[PDB]
Amino acid sequence: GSSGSSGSTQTDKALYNRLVPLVNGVREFSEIQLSRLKKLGIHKTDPSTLTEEEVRKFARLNIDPATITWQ
Numbered sequence: 001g002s003s004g005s006s007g008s009t010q011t012d013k014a015l016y017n018r019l020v021p022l023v024n025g026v027r028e029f030s031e032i033q034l035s036r037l038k039k040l041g042i043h044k045t046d047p048s049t050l051t052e053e054e055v056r057k058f059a060r061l062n063i064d065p066a067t068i069t070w071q
Contacts, residue, residue, distance in 0.1 A: 011069070012056040019059065020047050036061065 001017050020027050027047045029037070037044065040061075042054050050058070 012052070012059045015059045015062075016047070016055050019062070033058070 001014075019033065020029060029045060029047065034045070037058060040054075040057060042050070042058070044050055044054065
């Protein structure tokens, strides 16, 4: 990715990347993220099927102290 100017409605999207990075040349959740997604009811494995609605949700549950943003 690339950090710079403040894009549009760029809040969850940005995070999504951090959560599911790309090092193996293939974006795929982890036994950790999943176990958490299930609780919500999102039976998805690939980050592609995920939708803004799901993304924002998967991120919401995860709130970092460094970037504490109170909607």
